[PDB]
Design a protein around this ligand. Structure first.
Ligand code: NI
Length: 152
């Protein structure tokens, strides 16, 4: 099997100019299935304020970020398909894509791809650990038809 049930939550004042739910679905299929097959993730797009708040109260960082990853812990001895949530700030994503001169769409995809990896247990604090994650990101991204966000 291969199935990623997506719960897309648009929680911005506007909600216009965001990726189509099918796009998120597409990006999600290129990252998760190959690790869980049967799974489901929630992804809510928010505004700087909420992001700022979530980031400060859960990561202890006074500022908004592009992607907050909240991986679901599975209680010892339990079958669970729920992977966690991705909180993506549209303001940050749009600003970054502009500063890095990347296609807004390609950056969004990167956000859910990177985020999804964090949901699956990947991290990038340790050089070796990061090397493995970026390798995967690059791979997934090329397979989606976007340029490799790395190699700069
Ligand atoms: Ni990260």
């Amino acid at each position: 099997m291969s199935q990623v049930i997506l719960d897309l939550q648009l929680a911005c004042e506007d909600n216009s100019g965001l990726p189509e739910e099918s796009q998120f679905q597409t990006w999600l299929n290129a990252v998760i299935p190959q690790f869980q097959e049967e799974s489901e993730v929630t992804i809510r797009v928010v505004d700087t304020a909420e992001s700022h708040s979530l980031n400060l109260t859960y990561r202890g960082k006074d500022k908004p970020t592009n992607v907050l990853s909240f991986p679901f812990e599975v209680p010892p001895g339990m079958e669970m398909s729920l992977l966690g949530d991705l909180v993506i700030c549209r303001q940050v994503v749009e600003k970054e894509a502009q500063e890095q001169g990347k296609p807004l769409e390609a950056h969004w995809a990167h956000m859910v791809v990177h985020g999804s990896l964090h949901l699956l247990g990947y991290d990038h604090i340790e050089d070796d650990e990061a090397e493995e994650m970026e390798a995967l990101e690059t791979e997934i991204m090329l397979a989606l038809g976007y340029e490799d966000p790395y190699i700069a």
